[PDB]
Amino acid sequence: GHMEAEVDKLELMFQKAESDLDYIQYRLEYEIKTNHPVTLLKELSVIKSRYQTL
């Protein structure tokens, strides 16, 4: 189509953007996988309580 064609392009671009993002992610995951703050928050709670209880 005409604008339909334009839209076909837009959709194509988005799909690229997605696989772009998808790769960036894939790589980051690869970087981390090569050698094997979350629990730190949980720990920082147990003490800030024990101060207050004592």
Binding site: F14, I24, L28
Partner: protein, 50 residues
Amino acid sequence: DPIRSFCGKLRSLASTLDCETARLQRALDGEESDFEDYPMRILYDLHSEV
């Protein structure tokens, strides 16, 4: 109005797609500085709390 009103929303999704893909690449590469600079600053605050 109802024309651009749609596109405006669409546009923002683009601008976002543009901007963040750019930087996230850089961040992946070790540039862009925001990503090693700010987590520092909040980690240093968190330290200061402790």
